[PDB]
Symmetry: C3
Subunit: 112 residues, 3 copies
């Protein structure tokens, strides 16, 4: 599985990144039952004038996760809820300034 977090530069500190990484990992290994050694979390930062919401300069938080297909929605939704809650708990950011998406990738489409 691959989780990518995109925020405007200056949003996350090193401690917050470390926290989110350990948490997101634990969330996946708990909701899916997979070994952590295959769970990858990536953090990317955007320049202040490179993030827009409704056509205006903003600071949205986008977290995207690619997981393996063959899982019920209750599982995906559980991951969505947990990831959403933990980011808001770590950063204190607003809910509508946070977007989380977990998509399916067929196992036949990946090689690890």
């Amino acid at each position: 599985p691959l989780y990518e977090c995109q925020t405007v530069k200056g949003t996350l500190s090193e401690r917050q990144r470390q926290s989110l990484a350990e948490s997101i990992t634990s969330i996946h290994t708990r909701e899916t039952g997979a070994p952590a050694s295959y769970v990858h979390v990536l953090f990317k930062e955007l320049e202040p004038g490179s993030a827009f919401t409704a056509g205006q300069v903003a600071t949205p938080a986008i977290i995207r996760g690619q997981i393996r297909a063959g899982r019920p929605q209750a599982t995906r939704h559980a991951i969505l809820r947990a990831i959403t809650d933990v980011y808001m708990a770590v950063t204190g950011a607003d809910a509508n300034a946070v977007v989380v998406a977990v998509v399916d990738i067929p196992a036949s489409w990946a090689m690890e």
Copy 2:
């Protein structure tokens, strides 16, 4: 909905990113009938010599958009065309060096 623009470092200015963000937002809100508040546009730059076309160093432009599934193909094509026409007009780029993709995301795969 999320739109991401990937170009070589130095391609877009502040004014251009503002224009493209406003343009993409307007195009999406019209064709899909979705509010602007949910429309997010991100800009990412690539280091010189890290973008390749036909095995050689080039400056392609990649704009990818993840929208809600359930809308007809004519709607998607209209979004594809408009974004492509706009980017070429704003930047002056070659059509053969511009790639736009609008993929469907199931409504229950995202949380916001």
Copy 3:
């Protein structure tokens, strides 16, 4: 066709990026029968400490390829194993620290 390579900043030399760009382009054109002019390879770098495996900081390598739908699995698999072998040869990375994915995008969903 679009191939993105995510690594920790400093992992790939410019010569390594060149070699990977050519071989990946070569593999795709060999297995699909598509012109090289449509093949785009992008190299993105992550800041050290912004890339995590399990719970801690690591140096994973993510190569994601977006190709067009309508092609059989054997084609995609051949691309997957080839890219995997080539990357581990060029860089010397561990197989457990390398992830390759090749996803489908319907021709109606892209424009170039």
